[PDB]
Amino acid sequence: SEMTPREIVSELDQHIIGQADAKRAVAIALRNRWRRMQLQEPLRHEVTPKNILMIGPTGVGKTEIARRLAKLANAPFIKVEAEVDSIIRDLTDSAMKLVRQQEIAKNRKLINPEELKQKAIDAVEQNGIVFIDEIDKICKKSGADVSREGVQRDLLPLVEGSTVSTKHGMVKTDHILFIASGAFQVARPSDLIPELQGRLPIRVELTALSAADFERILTEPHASLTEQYKALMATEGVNIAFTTDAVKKIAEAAFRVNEKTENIGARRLHTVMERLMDKISFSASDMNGQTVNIDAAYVADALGEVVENEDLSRFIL
Amino acid sequence: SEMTPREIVSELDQHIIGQADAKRAVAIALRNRWRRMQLQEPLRHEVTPKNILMIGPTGVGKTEIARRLAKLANAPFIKVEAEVDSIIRDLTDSAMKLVRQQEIAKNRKLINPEELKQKAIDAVEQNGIVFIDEIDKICKKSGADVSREGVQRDLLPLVEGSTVSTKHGMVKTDHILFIASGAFQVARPSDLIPELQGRLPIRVELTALSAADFERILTEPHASLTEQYKALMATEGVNIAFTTDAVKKIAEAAFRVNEKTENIGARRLHTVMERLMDKISFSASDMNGQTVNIDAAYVADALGEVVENEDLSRFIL
Amino acid sequence: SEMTPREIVSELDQHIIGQADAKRAVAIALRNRWRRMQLQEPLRHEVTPKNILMIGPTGVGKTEIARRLAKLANAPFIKVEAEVDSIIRDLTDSAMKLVRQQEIAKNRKLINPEELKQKAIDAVEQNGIVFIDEIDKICKKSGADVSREGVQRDLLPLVEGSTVSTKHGMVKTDHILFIASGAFQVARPSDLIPELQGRLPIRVELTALSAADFERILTEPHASLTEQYKALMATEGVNIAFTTDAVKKIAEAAFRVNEKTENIGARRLHTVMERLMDKISFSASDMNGQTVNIDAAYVADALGEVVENEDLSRFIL
Amino acid sequence: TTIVSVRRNGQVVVGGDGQVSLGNTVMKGNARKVRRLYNGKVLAGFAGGTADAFTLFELFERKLEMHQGHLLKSAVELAKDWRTDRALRKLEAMLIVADEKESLIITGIGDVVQPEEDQILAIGSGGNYALSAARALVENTELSAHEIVEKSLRIAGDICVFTNTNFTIEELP
Amino acid sequence: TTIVSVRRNGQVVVGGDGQVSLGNTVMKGNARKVRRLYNGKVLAGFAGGTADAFTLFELFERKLEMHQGHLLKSAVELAKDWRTDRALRKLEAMLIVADEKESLIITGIGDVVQPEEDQILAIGSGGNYALSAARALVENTELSAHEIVEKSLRIAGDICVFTNTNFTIEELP
Numbered sequence A, B, C: 001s002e003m004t005p006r007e008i009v010s011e012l013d014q015h016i017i018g019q020a021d022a023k024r025a026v027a028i029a030l031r032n033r034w035r036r037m038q039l040q041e042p043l044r045h046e047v048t049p050k051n052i053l054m055i056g057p058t059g060v061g062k063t064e065i066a067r068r069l070a071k072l073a074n075a076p077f078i079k080v081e082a083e084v085d086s087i088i089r090d091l092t093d094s095a096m097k098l099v100r101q102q103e104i105a106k107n108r109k110l111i112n113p114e115e116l117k118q119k120a121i122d123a124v125e126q127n128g129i130v131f132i133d134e135i136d137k138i139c140k141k142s143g144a145d146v147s148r149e150g151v152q153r154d155l156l157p158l159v160e161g162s163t164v165s166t167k168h169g170m171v172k173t174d175h176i177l178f179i180a181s182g183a184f185q186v187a188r189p190s191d192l193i194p195e196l197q198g199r200l201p202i203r204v205e206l207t208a209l210s211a212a213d214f215e216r217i218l219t220e221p222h223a224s225l226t227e228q229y230k231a232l233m234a235t236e237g238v239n240i241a242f243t244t245d246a247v248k249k250i251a252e253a254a255f256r257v258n259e260k261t262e263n264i265g266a267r268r269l270h271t272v273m274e275r276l277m278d279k280i281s282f283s284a285s286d287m288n289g290q291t292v293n294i295d296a297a298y299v300a301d302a303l304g305e306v307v308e309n310e311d312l313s314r315f316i317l
Numbered sequence D, E: 001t002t003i004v005s006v007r008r009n010g011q012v013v014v015g016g017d018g019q020v021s022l023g024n025t026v027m028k029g030n031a032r033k034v035r036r037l038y039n040g041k042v043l044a045g046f047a048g049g050t051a052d053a054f055t056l057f058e059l060f061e062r063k064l065e066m067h068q069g070h071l072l073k074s075a076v077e078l079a080k081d082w083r084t085d086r087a088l089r090k091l092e093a094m095l096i097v098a099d100e101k102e103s104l105i106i107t108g109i110g111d112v113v114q115p116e117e118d119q120i121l122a123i124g125s126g127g128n129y130a131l132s133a134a135r136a137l138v139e140n141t142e143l144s145a146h147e148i149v150e151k152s153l154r155i156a157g158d159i160c161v162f163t164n165t166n167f168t169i170e171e172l173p
Ligand SMILES: Nc1ncnc2c1ncn2[C@@H]1O[C@H](COP(=O)(O)OP(=O)(O)OP(=O)(O)O)[C@@H](O)[C@H]1O
Pocket: A015, A016, A017, A018, A019, A057, A058, A059, A060, A061, A062, A063, A064, A065, A133, A134, A181, A217, A221, A265, A266, A267, B195
């Protein structure tokens, strides 16, 4: 009773435009944790999920693809960045609001908090997605101490298979699906203890977002910034047009800023829009019933310009 | 059911005179967390508040504008200066006295324990203002260790969106509105992890308070020092006149001290007044029914003079 | 009521192909903890199990032989890699599954917990296998501090015989059977405190896995990768043939990678297969009812090639 | 060593000989003294006795592949790691780095220097000899920045006893 | 000392004399200067005053028996332990290491050097004397890498006052 990879991909292409091999490897991660169901006893209690390792920049969609696969597949989700067993005790506390959010709006009394003690556990030991953001931040070189390789050691019994003791009972982990992300610009995947490199067989590399890629992320995705502002400003009683020649000057204007400062990724769009929808957001109420055309001419003279700091003339002889 | 930005501004111009762009960006922060209400399901559970970053001196009104927007908009407030999840457990304990106080003073029995753990959390997850004072105090350079960048890391799941477990239940944070302040004289905004620069799109810069600005802050604001002393001394049965030529010599006498010592900001007025209303505050009772005229002549010979220390002649050859 | 060594060996030769002296010493470890039963009172409460020390590479089967002797002999199991008494409190929480799942479908109400608190304990104290992976990681040289020799000291009362206080009662340890593994490439067994070298009489040395040994581990073991994929892809409605000339090119292709990078051991097969069953796993559903022949020609042009990094030309003059 | 860098007509060249000297003897004479950094985006030539000369090279890399290959910023980020309270040791060496945009010289003591108007840089014992021939050519000939680096390096190998005619040259784009 | 290594016809030989010098006096004259590492998989000859010369030896072992005997990688892993922020002391010595595949020279300052085309390596006071005789032979005779090392060592014992004719030679395979 679950989708096909071809469909998981296509359902992700609506909130996370771009990438590719990203979704693919993530899809087959879900698809084969289900195919694990239609099996006897021997070939079923032993077949650990092929964990994933996402290698890519910052703000390219390493966390999105892990989130839009926790709801659009429904399962306990949790993100953590390097106690260790309290990562499972939180995956369980995020199981109740599912096995009792829809079920409470379905069973209507019939409470029985004794089944959410063995039926909400099946909701974890089976459907469990643990996301480790910034895992490259715990590798051997770091130029003084190597205790970051201790965290990588306490975080081993989990990706392997142990029995975490939560307040709902003994929840196994052997079948949970772990996905770790990392920039891996300083270190390399092989800089992780070998006794855990073979517990992350899937290696998927995400790419950065170009000028055109920033153009699409601005509209195509559901609840895109173009729509979010079209709606948040429609409630004021104002309509707003986001022409296409003006979307280019917002994607190729938030990119110009990512290649001259820190590359925060897509999140650069939010800080750009907020400066654009600055003039309107304030006096929107006092301008009820008006269709404002946001084009190249408006966007251009909306923010200004952003050249590099001064680096040189300051500390260089 | 909430004010307009034009009004939030004008209601703030009564306790916090001065600034400008300060209030403006703070206003639209509240206005658009409401406009978020009148929306369907998709474009509603996903539209994080455009957090704010106030860059300004010390004692210019970075905390006031965050406080006079927690009452004059009514919502759980809390100030913190760099556990991390216990910042939410305190935003909830400050959301009690607005139910077991407010919802018993409008719709006055009627207890119901399992009714406040749904009437209060729905108020935090929606109305929540977390204020981080002195955030510039946790940046990369600091000339030895960089663990201050660890705090900036544990304080990430919150500004992003997680589920803090309080004693009242699982309260989400995704929609809370965070406002961080900083002097940013040593560091720069860009000295903060990029994985959090895009989660604070609003950049507002407050200015310092001049001689004239100290003159106004002394009267115009509700409960100004001129009024607070006029009243606290009226209870003694004494009336007191604060002439205008004497307000100048108190603003341009508390400014003279901020440009020759630490610039504590407006809070300099309190320590100045306390030295002025020193002679009167003591023998006010024993002088019932008298109208004292506090003018240039009185203020002048009320405190004295304050020239620089001795710096030089001490340790310089 | 338990098997013979000759049989324990033969039952292990189905999931852990290879090794030899490995199983042998492990077998007689179980066989003689039973022979301890058929004895009077004096020669019975005093005869500590001859603990084992497995010296071998990484991914050769040091943990498998300890796991396939916890189920195929049924007893509380637990793996730990250097609190210390909480290793017993977990061996007990793992004993509530062979008494509440072994006597729930057997002795079948019957509740009486004060009845199983001496039926569960009697178990652990008798059938108890504590596995210490990577014990060589706590020896004297490490070039600065020697607190790792403190862990080797707190982990002494257990291998000796004390009384750990769990939430189920006072469970003795004197008769538990401990098995510690280690690479021992940097250190030597004798680098362990003498007051614990004589509490691990059995010294078994496992060998590494060759080209041929990787060929067998790919099929012969129950739930081998060849079968696991044959089944996980049969559920998609697809059949797959793993010819023999293609199993050689997967064992002698995962070995080629272990002698040019970290030698992760057998776990190398998983990462190799995952790259092979990459093309199929994705579009398996959309290709229902097909028998794909995976031979030398397919495997060859399935992954590509893997020559050393670049080491030289980068940092060497 | 002799490491020199000329820049003419959107061209950035960086050459250096290949003699590893130990005392007054020659241990290796083919050594590559000019290496490529950031996937081939920047050129780096070093001088100053292997060890330090190398660790200075690495440190500038960990700074490029952490700042998007922004030469100038990477440079200063590195320099600042010496100008603090807790120093970063002290390196007996110096680098000449250059990409399509800028060219610099970074010392393991913590300072970054920009060329003079002509945009020519040289370091190492044979330094000034090359720098003298370079300026000579740049200011009086039409030769490409490559030809000049080539020519200047030889002039310097024939005067410096710690410089040979066995060099490796790299250019951008 | 005088430590030399020649490589000809799938042969890798590494020889060295056996004179431990203290001041201008000879304390021990049989000393084994070329030892075997990794169960006999790699050859190592050292020079540079006992203590440091030794601790450099050990450090390269703890790196081989931690990298599957991959000479080159073990070498660089060790070198990198000097080129960091927190240095690894500094050793007054150097090693000539070689297995069936490659041959190197590692200094306790943190650098790894590859031979020149002829694949000949020498170190120590009597270094260049052996290296001169070696190149002489390799380039003009048919002698085996063993015969050459043997011959080259003697030529150097008769010129260096800190090198004797009492040597120990090891070869691979
Ligand atoms: N491919 C994409 N298409 C559209 N929006 C994207 C994409 N990738 C990221 N975003 C946007 O980025 C924000 C979320 O960032 P995200 O969690 O994806 O970062 P990341 O790539 O995981 O990096 P890090 O984990 O290092 O911060 C959201 O605003 C989301 O819309």
